[PDB]
Ligand binder design. Structure first.
Ligand SMILES: Nc1nc2nc(C(=O)NCCNC(=O)Nc3ccccc3)cnc2c(=O)[nH]1
Length: 268
């Protein structure tokens, strides 16, 4: 047999990548993460986890290498989170947050011979501890990505040490999930690809990543766009930047996590 559907796959390679091919990739990931059901202040909202059928729950990102290697990451559509990956005959999942997530990930990579669930979760704090480095000290760009794809591919066979695996996840998550979430972070990665120059993320990138949930909730709870409480971000040079309203974020955030139902008066 072969029980219906199967999750959408988007392909990207680091080999010969360009600003245009990376832009096409991120646009496609955003297109599979959202449905068009839910747009607030011109900003798409991800599907609500509540009642979402398991057949619509994930997307697959197949990454390949100039080294001719390929790994497939699985992203949860509710939050763009990388929940695990497959490399040939092994799959690995981060420790699930709850029982319902544990069941859901049994629907991924269902014919791999070897399935493992890490005993650690996949949040940045945990991965930074394992990597022995913070995000601010881990270079991003097309070279880091090419190297991360090889690292994930060789984990099975003892080639990749834990610290290097956790660093490689840190690279993938920011270059795929965070770029999908934020046009600003997609733009940061386009710069590094255009000049083929790797560099660690500056405070503007890091404070956006750390603030995604808070900004999603502040936008969704706003009064016609106005925040009850401002949110402080940082500029590139580390100086503070106060956000009072959704308006200044329209060019910056591309997707929000679903927090609250939209109040009457906005998709009519
Ligand atoms: N594996 C993984 N790990 C990740 N870890 C983080 C991370 O710690 N974020 C720091 C906390 N920031 C934040 O507002 N989080 C958030 C809010 C709602 C839903 C998901 C994340 C982000 N993305 C990812 C991700 O996309 N995949």
């Amino acid at each position: 047999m072969i029980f219906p559907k199967q999750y959408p796959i988007i392909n990207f390679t680091t080999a010969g990548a360009t600003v245009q091919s990376y832009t096409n990739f991120i646009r496609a990931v955003r297109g599979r993460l959202t449905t068009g059901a839910d747009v607030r202040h011109e900003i798409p909202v991800l599907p609500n986890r509540v009642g979402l059928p398991i057949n619509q729950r994930f997307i697959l990102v197949e990454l390949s290498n100039h080294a001719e290697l390929s790994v497939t990451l699985a992203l949860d559509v509710t939050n763009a989170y990388v929940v695990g990956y497959r490399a040939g005959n092994s799959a690995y999942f981060f420790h699930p947050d709850n029982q319902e997530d544990a069941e859901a990930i049994t629907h991924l990579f269902t014919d791999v011979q070897n399935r493992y669930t890490f005993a650690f979760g996949g949040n940045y704090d945990r991965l930074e501890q394992l990597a022995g480095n913070l995000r601010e000290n881990i270079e991003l760009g097309n070279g880091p990505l090419e190297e991360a794809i090889s690292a994930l591919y060789y984990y099975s066979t003892g080639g990749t040490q834990l610290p290097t695996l956790a660093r490689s996840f840190i690279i993938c998550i920011q270059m795929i999930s965070e770029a999908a979430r934020f046009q600003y972070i997609e733009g940061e990665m386009r710069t590094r690809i255009r000049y083929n120059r790797r560099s660690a993320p500056d405070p503007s990138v890091i404070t956006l990543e750390n603030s995604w949930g808070r900004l999603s909730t502040a936008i969704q709870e706003s009064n016609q766009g106005a925040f009850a409480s401002p949110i402080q971000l940082q500029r590139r040079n580390g100086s503070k930047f106060s956000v009072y309203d959704v308006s200044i974020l329209i060019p910056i955030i591309a997707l929000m996590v679903y927090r609250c139902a939209p109040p009457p008066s906005s998709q009519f």
